[PDB]
Structures are given as C-alpha cells and as structure tokens.
Amino acid sequence: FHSFSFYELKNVTNNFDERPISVGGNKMGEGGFGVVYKGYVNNTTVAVKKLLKQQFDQEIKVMAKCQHENLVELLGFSSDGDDLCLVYVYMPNGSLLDRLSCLDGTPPLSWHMRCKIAQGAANGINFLHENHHIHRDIKSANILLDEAFTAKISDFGLARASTVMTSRIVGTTAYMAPEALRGEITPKSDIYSFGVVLLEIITGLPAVDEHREPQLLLDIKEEIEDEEKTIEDYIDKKMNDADSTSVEAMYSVASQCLHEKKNKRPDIKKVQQLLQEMTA
C-alpha cells in the first residue's frame, strides 16, 4: 500500500470540489460514509473516499489479503489531516445500482452485459468466501463498474473473517436474509443478498420502493410461485436482447439464493456454475 498526505488529496480533487463531474466538478458520489472525489494523481485518476475508525481499519485489513479481478483495489489512504481518506482505483462507470436506473442519462445495460456483470460479481463473492470472508453488505450500490463494465465488489468496512451470532446487526434491510436480520453471521447470507441483486439485474427495479406492490423486490418471488404473476411481467423492458431461456435461468438461480432456509441455498460455487452454464 501507500500513505498519502491530506492536502495532497485535497489538491488532487481540485480542493474537495463537491460539485458533480457533469457540471465541471470532482464529486462522484455521496451518502453515508462520505463523498468520493475524482482525483488526478500522476495521470492516475483515483477515487478519493473521504470520511468509524474500526471500519476504516477493517477495509484496509481486508483489502490487504484479498486481491482479485472482481474486487475494487485499494491503492492508498490518508491518516493525516482532518477527515480520514481512502484511495481506490477509479471506477468510471459507477455502481450497478446507478446504471440499472440510467442515472444522469447513461444508456440502459444490455442483457448480455448484465449476464457478464452477474458472472463477475459471483466470481468476486466466490473469492471472498474461498478466503473465509463474509461481506455482510452485498448489494447493487456496492458493485462498481470499471471502463469495460467489469463488476467489482466494494465496501469491506463491515466485512468479517470466518456459524456465529453477533449482538450488532448490520447490513441493508431490503437485501438482508432472515437469519442475518436476527444477528446470525454466515456466508449463506451473502448468497441471499446476491439473490436480491439478481432480481435487480433482471427487472431493473430498486430493492425497495414504498410506492409499489410489493414494496420489497424480494417478495415478487412469492407472486411468481403463487403463479399470480409471471417473470415476464417483471423483466426489464429497457432491453431487447434478453432471450426468455437465459432470463428464466438467471431467475432460477436468484430464486434458489432467496430460499428462506439458509441451508437450503446453494453456495457461491454452485451459483458460479449455474450462471456460467447460463451463457454457455
């Protein structure tokens, strides 16, 4: 890794220019954790995530021995200055969540591209588990896309090494498995979360929408099993290259990932296979 000076990162981001890139600024994203500014360091654009001290330490401890094509890469950090910073490789295309909703006018993702993104994300989760790590916050917004739209799992601040139980329940409600919501800590929960992500990919719909029926995306699975609604009713209409065969196949994996009984769910390796056999 590599340490950085605070100002160093301040000057690189045009002095923490919180104005969006489309208007001429250096601001890429916000919410929670903090703002992520586009930096220019030696022609090497980076992602300056400015900020809790335990999570700043975890991300760096995890990024330490988990290097893979489908995981964001940690370049450096800044421990000096006021707010703590983290430097990752720059992810041009943002999050899968923002691309599924065509934020700022970006073109809808083709079905073909979505299949590769699902594959890439699964290979990422797989790597994390083979290394006995549990993400705990697998979701659409935590899947970033690079120039070639390669999926990269991000945000390891809540990540854990490894079934145990915790008193401090964390994650995102709309993506959380039953046992996870009760405080259980297990890789089986990442699979469930990924299942919700596969539904986002298929339908282009956000995990939760108050003005909607159902309000939680995960429940459309019951509407489909109760044959009161079909998968075709939910397929994202902002595509024209999605063959019914592989769409149903991805839905099959998604349905399996969303099984209420954590022991009834397939493991990541199985998820990898099915997704692979889906495009084969």
XYZ file of N, CA and C in Angstrom:
840
model
N 0.826 -1.245 0.000
C 0.000 0.000 0.000
C 0.843 1.271 0.000
N 0.200 2.421 0.189
C 0.911 3.694 0.159
C 0.175 4.826 0.897
N 0.859 5.470 1.843
C 0.257 6.565 2.603
C 0.174 7.844 1.785
N -0.754 8.716 2.155
C -0.911 9.981 1.456
C -1.101 11.128 2.439
N -0.759 12.333 2.007
C -0.965 13.484 2.859
C -2.399 13.915 2.584
N -3.027 14.553 3.566
C -4.399 15.012 3.394
C -4.502 16.015 2.242
N -3.886 17.181 2.409
C -3.916 18.225 1.383
C -3.578 17.627 0.016
N -2.574 16.765 -0.002
C -2.136 16.082 -1.207
C -3.407 15.684 -1.979
N -4.292 14.994 -1.267
C -5.562 14.518 -1.799
C -6.583 15.637 -1.982
N -6.341 16.761 -1.315
C -7.226 17.913 -1.412
C -6.944 18.639 -2.721
N -5.658 18.809 -3.022
C -5.221 19.475 -4.244
C -5.577 18.652 -5.485
N -5.450 17.329 -5.359
C -5.733 16.372 -6.435
C -7.202 16.361 -6.859
N -8.081 16.658 -5.908
C -9.522 16.679 -6.125
C -10.011 18.097 -6.388
N -9.091 18.956 -6.828
C -9.402 20.354 -7.107
C -9.941 20.998 -5.815
N -9.273 20.687 -4.704
C -9.627 21.174 -3.368
C -11.025 20.743 -2.911
N -11.232 19.429 -2.844
C -12.507 18.849 -2.426
C -13.686 19.543 -3.092
N -13.681 19.516 -4.425
C -14.744 20.113 -5.226
C -15.901 19.126 -5.180
N -16.903 19.455 -4.360
C -18.097 18.634 -4.135
C -19.132 18.767 -5.251
N -18.797 19.544 -6.276
C -19.693 19.736 -7.411
C -19.587 18.519 -8.332
N -20.734 18.026 -8.826
C -20.766 16.867 -9.723
C -19.867 17.048 -10.950
N -19.323 15.934 -11.443
C -18.429 15.921 -12.605
C -19.073 16.479 -13.886
N -20.373 16.242 -14.056
C -21.096 16.708 -15.242
C -21.215 18.235 -15.332
N -21.081 18.914 -14.196
C -21.167 20.370 -14.168
C -19.761 20.977 -14.180
N -18.751 20.117 -14.042
C -17.370 20.570 -14.053
C -16.620 20.366 -12.747
N -17.181 19.560 -11.851
C -16.536 19.333 -10.569
C -15.732 18.053 -10.413
N -15.515 17.665 -9.158
C -14.763 16.460 -8.822
C -15.577 15.493 -7.950
N -16.855 15.789 -7.755
C -17.695 14.933 -6.934
C -18.301 13.802 -7.773
N -18.149 12.568 -7.289
C -18.670 11.380 -7.976
C -19.900 10.808 -7.268
N -19.772 10.586 -5.963
C -20.866 10.036 -5.185
C -20.854 10.543 -3.756
N -21.969 10.354 -3.058
C -22.099 10.818 -1.682
C -22.851 9.797 -0.823
N -23.580 10.295 0.171
C -24.340 9.426 1.047
C -23.482 8.686 2.054
N -24.090 8.340 3.188
C -23.397 7.617 4.243
C -21.923 7.947 4.391
N -21.098 6.902 4.407
C -19.645 7.016 4.541
C -19.068 8.406 4.260
N -19.392 8.958 3.094
C -18.899 10.276 2.736
C -18.912 10.540 1.242
N -18.152 11.541 0.821
C -18.083 11.874 -0.593
C -16.848 11.227 -1.231
N -16.997 10.843 -2.492
C -15.916 10.229 -3.242
C -15.593 11.170 -4.375
N -14.397 11.747 -4.328
C -13.983 12.693 -5.347
C -12.996 12.110 -6.337
N -13.156 12.508 -7.593
C -12.284 12.063 -8.658
C -10.955 12.789 -8.468
N -9.877 12.023 -8.359
C -8.570 12.619 -8.176
C -7.673 12.401 -9.380
N -6.666 13.250 -9.520
C -5.728 13.130 -10.615
C -4.342 13.080 -9.989
N -3.820 11.870 -9.809
C -2.506 11.657 -9.201
C -1.523 10.999 -10.165
N -0.650 11.794 -10.779
C 0.325 11.250 -11.726
C -0.397 10.656 -12.923
N -1.380 11.380 -13.444
C -2.160 10.902 -14.578
C -3.040 9.723 -14.170
N -2.842 9.225 -12.952
C -3.616 8.097 -12.450
C -4.841 8.527 -11.656
N -5.964 8.662 -12.350
C -7.199 9.049 -11.692
C -7.502 8.038 -10.593
N -7.862 8.534 -9.421
C -8.172 7.658 -8.310
C -9.553 7.997 -7.804
N -9.961 7.303 -6.749
C -11.254 7.536 -6.140
C -10.927 7.899 -4.712
N -11.117 9.174 -4.396
C -10.822 9.677 -3.069
C -12.056 9.669 -2.196
N -12.163 8.630 -1.373
C -13.292 8.485 -0.470
C -12.916 9.132 0.846
N -13.570 10.252 1.133
C -13.333 10.998 2.359
C -14.405 10.646 3.401
N -13.977 10.455 4.646
C -14.898 10.108 5.725
C -15.655 11.336 6.229
N -16.246 4.477 13.577
C -15.836 4.821 12.220
C -14.353 4.543 11.982
N -13.563 4.514 13.052
C -12.136 4.258 12.911
C -11.836 2.764 12.826
N -12.787 1.937 13.247
C -12.595 0.494 13.183
C -12.901 0.030 11.760
N -13.897 0.663 11.142
C -14.300 0.342 9.776
C -13.275 0.836 8.758
N -12.571 1.908 9.109
C -11.536 2.471 8.250
C -10.374 1.477 8.285
N -10.199 0.838 9.440
C -9.137 -0.143 9.651
C -9.434 -1.505 9.033
N -10.703 -1.902 9.057
C -11.114 -3.189 8.502
C -10.888 -3.221 6.994
N -11.497 -2.265 6.295
C -11.386 -2.146 4.844
C -9.944 -2.327 4.376
N -9.005 -1.708 5.088
C -7.584 -1.800 4.753
C -6.979 -3.150 5.148
N -7.546 -3.773 6.172
C -7.063 -5.069 6.632
C -7.554 -6.149 5.656
N -8.779 -5.967 5.162
C -9.395 -6.893 4.211
C -8.763 -6.737 2.831
N -8.686 -5.493 2.362
C -8.097 -5.191 1.064
C -6.654 -5.664 1.026
N -6.083 -5.871 2.206
C -4.707 -6.322 2.330
C -4.473 -7.689 1.695
N -5.231 -8.701 2.109
C -5.034 -10.035 1.544
C -6.183 -10.591 0.705
N -6.810 -9.710 -0.071
C -7.911 -10.066 -0.958
C -7.808 -9.258 -2.250
N -6.975 -9.740 -3.161
C -6.775 -9.091 -4.447
C -7.363 -9.985 -5.512
N -8.275 -9.435 -6.293
C -8.924 -10.208 -7.319
C -9.497 -9.251 -8.333
N -9.640 -9.749 -9.546
C -10.185 -9.002 -10.662
C -11.570 -8.389 -10.372
N -12.380 -9.079 -9.570
C -13.723 -8.593 -9.281
C -13.951 -7.898 -7.943
N -12.867 -7.409 -7.352
C -12.944 -6.661 -6.100
C -12.244 -5.317 -6.342
N -12.812 -4.207 -5.873
C -12.143 -2.918 -6.047
C -10.758 -3.057 -5.407
N -9.771 -2.351 -5.937
C -8.410 -2.431 -5.415
C -8.055 -1.231 -4.543
N -7.434 -1.491 -3.397
C -7.038 -0.400 -2.507
C -5.617 0.059 -2.845
N -5.495 1.309 -3.286
C -4.202 1.882 -3.634
C -3.554 2.438 -2.379
N -4.176 3.476 -1.829
C -3.658 4.110 -0.635
C -4.712 4.738 0.261
N -4.235 5.389 1.316
C -5.092 6.025 2.303
C -4.439 7.285 2.860
N -5.199 8.014 3.669
C -4.702 9.223 4.305
C -5.152 9.204 5.761
N -4.178 9.075 6.664
C -4.430 9.038 8.109
C -4.165 10.403 8.748
N -3.480 11.274 8.008
C -3.172 12.625 8.473
C -4.280 13.577 8.015
N -4.344 14.748 8.633
C -5.376 15.696 8.265
C -6.627 15.466 9.088
N -7.688 16.197 8.767
C -8.947 16.068 9.495
C -9.639 14.747 9.170
N -10.542 14.779 8.195
C -11.269 13.583 7.791
C -10.323 12.545 7.196
N -10.512 11.284 7.579
C -9.682 10.198 7.058
C -10.102 9.914 5.620
N -9.131 9.562 4.784
C -9.426 9.268 3.386
C -8.967 7.867 2.995
N -9.532 7.380 1.897
C -9.187 6.079 1.348
C -9.087 6.269 -0.153
N -8.071 5.646 -0.738
C -7.854 5.756 -2.168
C -7.937 4.375 -2.814
N -8.824 4.279 -3.792
C -9.059 3.048 -4.523
C -8.796 3.380 -5.965
N -8.863 2.373 -6.819
C -8.683 2.616 -8.229
C -9.973 3.327 -8.637
N -9.894 4.177 -9.653
C -11.072 4.907 -10.116
C -12.026 4.012 -10.901
N -13.298 4.017 -10.521
C -14.306 3.216 -11.216
C -15.205 4.163 -12.017
N -14.862 4.365 -13.292
C -15.526 5.219 -14.276
C -17.034 5.085 -14.356
N -17.504 3.851 -14.479
C -18.920 3.623 -14.645
C -19.826 3.557 -13.433
N -19.288 3.893 -12.263
C -20.084 3.918 -11.043
C -20.658 2.606 -10.548
N -21.829 2.682 -9.922
C -22.434 1.474 -9.386
C -23.439 0.825 -10.327
N -23.663 -0.462 -10.100
C -24.619 -1.242 -10.876
C -26.002 -0.609 -10.626
N -26.238 -0.210 -9.378
C -27.490 0.434 -9.000
C -27.745 1.669 -9.865
N -26.744 2.542 -9.966
C -26.897 3.746 -10.769
C -27.004 3.443 -12.280
N -26.426 2.335 -12.737
C -26.518 2.002 -14.156
C -27.843 1.293 -14.467
N -28.402 0.604 -13.472
C -29.674 -0.070 -13.668
C -30.794 0.964 -13.731
N -30.568 2.141 -13.163
C -31.595 3.167 -13.224
C -31.250 4.259 -14.239
N -30.173 4.046 -14.991
C -29.748 5.004 -16.012
C -29.561 6.413 -15.450
N -28.997 6.488 -14.257
C -28.741 7.756 -13.591
C -27.963 8.722 -14.488
N -28.385 9.982 -14.503
C -27.730 11.019 -15.309
C -27.816 10.814 -16.819
N -28.678 9.901 -17.260
C -28.831 9.666 -18.686
C -27.936 8.630 -19.347
N -27.314 7.745 -18.572
C -26.456 6.732 -19.181
C -27.363 5.699 -19.835
N -26.921 5.090 -20.949
C -27.670 4.074 -21.713
C -27.991 2.802 -20.923
N -29.216 2.265 -21.082
C -29.592 1.037 -20.365
C -28.555 -0.062 -20.628
N -28.368 -0.951 -19.659
C -27.428 -2.057 -19.805
C -28.103 -3.179 -20.588
N -27.422 -3.670 -21.621
C -27.963 -4.752 -22.428
C -28.023 -6.005 -21.563
N -28.855 -6.959 -21.961
C -28.973 -8.200 -21.224
C -27.625 -8.908 -21.219
N -26.952 -8.884 -22.362
C -25.650 -9.516 -22.493
C -24.671 -8.958 -21.462
N -24.614 -7.642 -21.350
C -23.718 -7.029 -20.389
C -24.111 -7.432 -18.955
N -25.409 -7.439 -18.667
C -25.888 -7.809 -17.341
C -25.476 -9.229 -16.937
N -25.411 -10.138 -17.904
C -25.023 -11.509 -17.611
C -23.573 -11.555 -17.188
N -22.738 -10.765 -17.862
C -21.315 -10.705 -17.542
C -21.123 -10.057 -16.162
N -21.945 -9.056 -15.858
C -21.861 -8.376 -14.572
C -22.245 -9.337 -13.441
N -23.286 -10.134 -13.658
C -23.710 -11.114 -12.656
C -22.587 -12.140 -12.472
N -21.991 -12.565 -13.580
C -20.893 -13.528 -13.523
C -19.728 -12.947 -12.730
N -19.283 -11.759 -13.136
C -18.171 -11.110 -12.461
C -18.392 -10.938 -10.971
N -19.595 -10.499 -10.594
C -19.929 -10.295 -9.192
C -19.863 -11.615 -8.420
N -20.338 -12.699 -9.033
C -20.311 -14.009 -8.382
C -18.875 -14.492 -8.172
N -18.002 -14.243 -9.146
C -16.604 -14.647 -9.043
C -15.954 -13.870 -7.914
N -16.450 -12.659 -7.687
C -15.911 -11.824 -6.630
C -16.322 -12.356 -5.269
N -17.612 -12.626 -5.111
C -18.120 -13.165 -3.863
C -17.439 -14.517 -3.614
N -17.289 -15.309 -4.673
C -16.656 -16.610 -4.536
C -15.269 -16.496 -3.943
N -14.486 -15.557 -4.465
C -13.130 -15.332 -3.991
C -13.147 -14.966 -2.517
N -14.048 -14.067 -2.144
C -14.158 -13.646 -0.757
C -14.434 -14.832 0.172
N -15.339 -15.719 -0.230
C -15.667 -16.871 0.608
C -14.536 -17.906 0.642
N -13.919 -18.200 -0.501
C -12.820 -19.166 -0.515
C -11.784 -18.705 0.500
N -11.699 -17.390 0.689
C -10.757 -16.809 1.628
C -11.376 -16.624 3.002
N -12.487 -17.316 3.239
C -13.175 -17.280 4.527
C -13.575 -15.883 4.996
N -14.149 -15.106 4.084
C -14.592 -13.758 4.397
C -16.069 -13.614 4.095
N -16.762 -12.855 4.924
C -18.179 -12.627 4.721
C -18.341 -11.129 4.519
N -18.930 -10.748 3.392
C -19.118 -9.341 3.071
C -20.109 -8.625 3.998
N -21.294 -9.205 4.157
C -22.351 -8.667 5.014
C -23.137 -7.472 4.464
N -22.736 -6.933 3.318
C -23.472 -5.814 2.738
C -23.469 -5.893 1.209
N -23.666 -7.103 0.707
C -23.707 -7.336 -0.719
C -24.954 -6.670 -1.279
N -24.756 -5.754 -2.217
C -25.877 -5.075 -2.831
C -25.475 -4.292 -4.060
N -26.488 -3.964 -4.838
C -26.395 -3.210 -6.071
C -25.417 -2.005 -6.047
N -25.545 -1.163 -5.026
C -24.705 0.021 -4.886
C -23.257 -0.337 -4.537
N -23.042 -1.541 -4.002
C -21.700 -1.962 -3.636
C -21.044 -2.774 -4.718
N -21.597 -2.702 -5.921
C -20.999 -3.391 -7.053
C -20.652 -2.284 -8.044
N -19.360 -2.023 -8.188
C -18.893 -0.967 -9.076
C -18.483 -1.498 -10.447
N -18.472 -0.607 -11.430
C -18.146 -0.971 -12.806
C -16.983 -0.149 -13.346
N -15.990 -0.809 -13.929
C -14.848 -0.085 -14.473
C -15.108 0.288 -15.935
N -14.085 0.790 -16.627
C -14.227 1.224 -18.025
C -14.866 0.180 -18.938
N -14.478 -1.083 -18.758
C -15.012 -2.178 -19.561
C -16.270 -2.788 -18.939
N -16.811 -2.126 -17.921
C -18.000 -2.608 -17.217
C -17.787 -3.920 -16.464
N -16.562 -4.145 -15.999
C -16.251 -5.336 -15.210
C -16.767 -5.050 -13.805
N -17.571 -5.949 -13.258
C -18.114 -5.770 -11.915
C -17.028 -5.882 -10.852
N -17.063 -4.986 -9.872
C -16.102 -5.009 -8.772
C -16.841 -4.814 -7.445
N -16.786 -5.830 -6.594
C -17.431 -5.771 -5.290
C -16.674 -4.732 -4.460
N -17.396 -3.858 -3.768
C -16.742 -2.849 -2.937
C -17.345 -2.755 -1.531
N -16.747 -1.890 -0.716
C -17.156 -1.617 0.656
C -16.973 -2.807 1.585
N -15.764 -2.969 2.111
C -15.478 -4.077 3.016
C -15.366 -3.628 4.468
N -15.941 -2.462 4.759
C -15.908 -1.919 6.109
C -16.667 -2.729 7.151
N -17.608 -3.560 6.710
C -18.381 -4.395 7.625
C -17.975 -5.868 7.464
N -17.074 -6.134 6.521
C -16.609 -7.491 6.240
C -16.042 -8.212 7.458
N -16.284 -9.517 7.526
C -15.814 -10.348 8.629
C -15.105 -11.613 8.146
N -14.190 -12.121 8.968
C -13.473 -13.350 8.656
C -14.268 -14.490 9.311
N -14.137 -15.710 8.798
C -14.869 -16.836 9.370
C -14.026 -18.111 9.437
N -21.213 -21.293 11.976
C -21.985 -20.019 12.008
C -21.966 -19.419 13.413
N -21.670 -18.124 13.484
C -21.609 -17.394 14.751
C -22.777 -16.406 14.823
N -22.943 -15.752 15.965
C -24.008 -14.773 16.110
C -23.445 -13.504 16.753
N -23.942 -12.347 16.321
C -23.485 -11.060 16.838
C -24.617 -10.257 17.462
N -24.261 -9.352 18.367
C -25.247 -8.515 19.033
C -25.466 -7.253 18.220
N -24.514 -6.967 17.337
C -24.563 -5.781 16.487
C -24.976 -6.154 15.056
N -26.274 -6.084 14.786
C -26.793 -6.433 13.474
C -26.611 -5.308 12.459
N -25.948 -5.621 11.348
C -25.703 -4.635 10.299
C -25.972 -5.152 8.891
N -26.136 -4.212 7.966
C -26.401 -4.553 6.580
C -27.483 -3.640 6.047
N -28.044 -3.979 4.895
C -29.102 -3.166 4.329
C -30.364 -4.005 4.398
N -31.380 -3.457 5.049
C -32.639 -4.158 5.266
C -33.222 -4.895 4.079
N -33.445 -4.180 2.976
C -34.034 -4.765 1.774
C -33.253 -5.930 1.144
N -31.995 -6.119 1.538
C -31.187 -7.214 0.984
C -30.881 -8.290 2.016
N -31.237 -8.036 3.265
C -30.914 -8.972 4.325
C -31.711 -10.254 4.481
N -30.976 -11.350 4.620
C -31.557 -12.670 4.820
C -32.235 -12.718 6.192
N -33.140 -13.687 6.389
C -33.869 -13.858 7.654
C -32.924 -13.993 8.848
N -32.047 -14.987 8.791
C -31.095 -15.234 9.869
C -30.161 -14.047 10.103
N -29.791 -13.349 9.029
C -28.897 -12.197 9.149
C -29.599 -11.099 9.937
N -30.892 -10.938 9.690
C -31.663 -9.926 10.391
C -31.801 -10.253 11.868
N -31.594 -11.519 12.221
C -31.701 -11.942 13.611
C -30.349 -11.901 14.314
N -29.300 -11.531 13.576
C -27.978 -11.428 14.170
C -27.011 -12.530 13.786
N -27.447 -13.430 12.924
C -26.576 -14.514 12.523
C -25.513 -14.006 11.534
N -24.294 -14.534 11.651
C -23.179 -14.161 10.781
C -22.743 -15.379 9.972
N -23.030 -15.382 8.675
C -22.660 -16.516 7.836
C -22.641 -16.190 6.351
N -21.757 -16.854 5.599
C -21.637 -16.640 4.157
C -22.946 -16.907 3.414
N -23.789 -17.775 3.984
C -25.077 -18.100 3.375
C -25.895 -16.838 3.170
N -25.665 -15.839 4.017
C -26.406 -14.587 3.909
C -25.974 -13.760 2.691
N -24.688 -13.814 2.339
C -24.208 -13.085 1.170
C -24.965 -13.594 -0.069
N -25.132 -14.915 -0.154
C -25.833 -15.532 -1.283
C -27.259 -15.004 -1.423
N -27.944 -14.871 -0.295
C -29.311 -14.374 -0.267
C -29.335 -12.938 -0.823
N -28.423 -12.106 -0.323
C -28.299 -10.724 -0.761
C -28.042 -10.679 -2.264
N -27.152 -11.547 -2.748
C -26.828 -11.601 -4.166
C -28.099 -11.929 -4.945
N -28.946 -12.766 -4.343
C -30.196 -13.133 -4.978
C -31.049 -11.895 -5.224
N -31.082 -10.984 -4.259
C -31.863 -9.776 -4.464
C -31.214 -8.993 -5.595
N -29.883 -8.987 -5.638
C -29.179 -8.267 -6.694
C -29.520 -8.854 -8.074
N -29.662 -10.173 -8.161
C -30.009 -10.781 -9.441
C -31.409 -10.316 -9.864
N -32.305 -10.084 -8.899
C -33.642 -9.602 -9.245
C -33.544 -8.167 -9.768
N -32.620 -7.382 -9.216
C -32.440 -6.005 -9.680
C -31.963 -6.019 -11.136
N -31.046 -6.937 -11.423
C -30.490 -7.086 -12.757
C -31.540 -7.500 -13.784
N -32.429 -8.394 -13.380
C -33.475 -8.904 -14.256
C -34.597 -7.914 -14.538
N -35.027 -7.226 -13.490
C -36.146 -6.306 -13.579
C -35.796 -4.837 -13.708
N -34.567 -4.465 -13.356
C -34.192 -3.069 -13.414
C -34.861 -2.283 -12.292
N -35.479 -2.977 -11.339
C -36.158 -2.304 -10.225
C -35.295 -2.254 -8.973
N -35.415 -1.170 -8.197
C -34.666 -0.962 -6.950
C -35.193 -1.927 -5.884
N -34.305 -2.367 -4.991
C -34.656 -3.321 -3.942
C -35.871 -2.934 -3.100
N -36.090 -1.641 -2.895
C -37.256 -1.214 -2.129
C -37.865 0.057 -2.699
N -39.189 0.057 -2.798
C -39.927 1.198 -3.320
C -41.257 1.293 -2.575
N -41.372 2.286 -1.696
C -42.591 2.488 -0.918
C -43.826 2.488 -1.815
N -43.759 3.246 -2.905
C -44.867 3.314 -3.845
C -44.753 2.133 -4.803
N -45.100 0.937 -4.335
C -45.022 -0.247 -5.183
C -45.638 -1.466 -4.501
N -46.017 -2.454 -5.299
C -46.605 -3.667 -4.760
C -46.003 -4.884 -5.439
N -45.183 -5.653 -4.705
C -44.835 -5.401 -3.301
C -43.833 -4.262 -3.134
N -43.627 -3.820 -1.899
C -42.687 -2.738 -1.643
C -41.246 -3.244 -1.649
N -41.078 -4.525 -1.334
C -39.769 -5.162 -1.301
C -39.635 -6.095 -2.495
N -38.627 -5.834 -3.329
C -38.384 -6.627 -4.531
C -38.392 -8.128 -4.280
N -37.765 -8.556 -3.186
C -37.674 -9.976 -2.855
C -39.027 -10.712 -2.832
N -40.102 -9.999 -2.509
C -41.419 -10.613 -2.471
C -42.034 -10.962 -3.835
N -41.483 -10.458 -4.945
C -42.072 -10.799 -6.243
C -41.886 -12.294 -6.497
N -40.981 -12.901 -5.735
C -40.697 -14.328 -5.842
C -41.923 -15.150 -5.439
N -42.643 -14.670 -4.431
C -43.847 -15.340 -3.961
C -44.985 -15.108 -4.953
N -45.032 -13.910 -5.529
C -46.062 -13.598 -6.511
C -45.911 -14.510 -7.720
N -44.674 -14.873 -8.033
C -44.405 -15.739 -9.171
C -44.675 -17.204 -8.839
N -44.326 -17.629 -7.626
C -44.572 -19.012 -7.227
C -46.075 -19.248 -7.097
N -46.795 -18.246 -6.592
C -48.248 -18.334 -6.453
C -48.871 -18.156 -7.834
N -48.037 -18.241 -8.864
C -48.475 -18.074 -10.243
C -49.537 -17.000 -10.442
N -49.483 -15.943 -9.639
C -50.445 -14.859 -9.775
C -49.794 -13.775 -10.625
N -48.518 -13.988 -10.917
C -47.728 -13.066 -11.714
C -46.622 -13.900 -12.351
N -46.118 -13.449 -13.494
C -45.062 -14.174 -14.187
C -43.759 -13.387 -14.227
N -42.657 -14.089 -14.467
C -41.356 -13.445 -14.540
C -41.340 -12.461 -15.715
N -42.047 -12.802 -16.789
C -42.135 -11.943 -17.965
C -42.740 -10.599 -17.578
N -43.604 -10.601 -16.567
C -44.233 -9.360 -16.113
C -43.197 -8.430 -15.486
N -42.126 -9.012 -14.957
C -41.102 -8.225 -14.295
C -39.824 -7.922 -15.074
N -39.577 -8.646 -16.157
C -38.382 -8.429 -16.966
C -38.220 -6.956 -17.349
N -37.009 -6.431 -17.176
C -36.727 -5.032 -17.510
C -37.044 -4.814 -19.004
N -37.927 -3.871 -19.294
C -38.303 -3.578 -20.671
C -37.316 -2.655 -21.391
N -36.259 -2.247 -20.699
C -35.273 -1.374 -21.314
C -34.115 -2.194 -21.904
N -34.471 -3.295 -22.556
C -33.533 -4.203 -23.207
C -34.269 -4.780 -24.416
N -33.538 -5.399 -25.337
C -34.173 -6.027 -26.492
C -33.379 -7.271 -26.896
N -32.400 -7.626 -26.065
C -31.545 -8.781 -26.330
C -31.604 -9.857 -25.242
N -32.695 -9.886 -24.485
C -32.855 -10.858 -23.407
C -33.730 -12.035 -23.806
N -33.100 -13.154 -24.133
C -33.849 -14.339 -24.522
C -34.505 -14.959 -23.295
N -35.765 -15.346 -23.449
C -36.540 -15.950 -22.376
C -35.840 -17.123 -21.669
N -35.024 -17.866 -22.405
C -34.328 -19.010 -21.833
C -33.316 -18.639 -20.747
N -32.380 -17.744 -21.055
C -31.389 -17.385 -20.051
C -31.938 -16.446 -18.973
N -33.041 -15.759 -19.260
C -33.640 -14.872 -18.263
C -34.232 -15.751 -17.180
N -34.951 -16.780 -17.610
C -35.563 -17.729 -16.693
C -34.467 -18.471 -15.924
N -33.342 -18.725 -16.589
C -32.225 -19.412 -15.955
C -31.609 -18.563 -14.835
N -31.456 -17.256 -15.057
C -30.891 -16.398 -14.015
C -31.917 -16.299 -12.896
N -33.194 -16.268 -13.259
C -34.226 -16.182 -12.244
C -34.222 -17.436 -11.389
N -33.871 -18.560 -12.002
C -33.832 -19.830 -11.295
C -32.771 -19.778 -10.199
N -31.618 -19.196 -10.524
C -30.522 -19.054 -9.560
C -30.934 -18.067 -8.471
N -31.547 -16.967 -8.889
C -31.996 -15.945 -7.957
C -32.979 -16.561 -6.960
N -33.977 -17.283 -7.471
C -34.979 -17.929 -6.620
C -34.318 -18.844 -5.580
N -33.322 -19.610 -6.014
C -32.594 -20.513 -5.124
C -31.801 -19.762 -4.060
N -31.261 -18.603 -4.427
C -30.484 -17.810 -3.488
C -31.382 -17.208 -2.415
N -32.637 -16.946 -2.772
C -33.597 -16.334 -1.863
C -34.392 -17.319 -1.008
N -33.911 -18.553 -0.896
C -34.608 -19.543 -0.082
C -34.546 -19.091 1.378
N -35.676 -19.159 2.077
C -35.730 -18.737 3.477
C -34.829 -19.573 4.389
N -34.643 -20.846 4.051
C -33.799 -21.723 4.858
C -32.370 -21.629 4.348
N -31.531 -20.901 5.081
C -30.142 -20.697 4.681
C -29.407 -21.965 4.260
N -29.768 -23.102 4.846
C -29.125 -24.366 4.493
C -29.681 -24.933 3.193
N -30.790 -24.367 2.736
C -31.434 -24.801 1.504
C -30.871 -24.043 0.292
N -30.044 -23.036 0.554
C -29.461 -22.238 -0.520
C -28.201 -22.859 -1.077
N -27.925 -22.613 -2.360
C -26.711 -23.166 -2.957
C -25.548 -22.273 -2.505
N -24.335 -22.802 -2.470
C -23.194 -21.982 -2.079
C -22.735 -21.191 -3.313
N -21.830 -20.236 -3.111
C -21.344 -19.401 -4.210
C -20.804 -20.210 -5.392
N -20.045 -21.267 -5.107
C -19.504 -22.102 -6.175
C -20.631 -22.612 -7.061
N -21.731 -23.033 -6.443
C -22.863 -23.533 -7.208
C -23.459 -22.381 -8.005
N -23.567 -21.216 -7.373
C -24.096 -20.044 -8.054
C -23.227 -19.700 -9.270
N -21.908 -19.826 -9.121
C -20.981 -19.543 -10.216
C -21.254 -20.452 -11.398
N -21.376 -21.746 -11.109
C -21.633 -22.764 -12.125
C -22.906 -22.502 -12.921
N -24.021 -22.362 -12.213
C -25.304 -22.119 -12.849
C -25.292 -20.883 -13.736
N -24.645 -19.822 -13.263
C -24.568 -18.585 -14.024
C -23.703 -18.791 -15.251
N -22.678 -19.621 -15.099
C -21.760 -19.916 -16.188
C -22.465 -20.766 -17.241
N -23.217 -21.762 -16.778
C -23.954 -22.655 -17.670
C -25.107 -21.904 -18.329
N -25.393 -20.709 -17.822
C -26.476 -19.895 -18.356
C -26.134 -19.237 -19.684
N -24.860 -18.903 -19.860
C -24.401 -18.260 -21.083
C -23.731 -19.267 -22.007
N -23.313 -20.398 -21.444
C -22.664 -21.436 -22.233
C -23.618 -21.891 -23.331
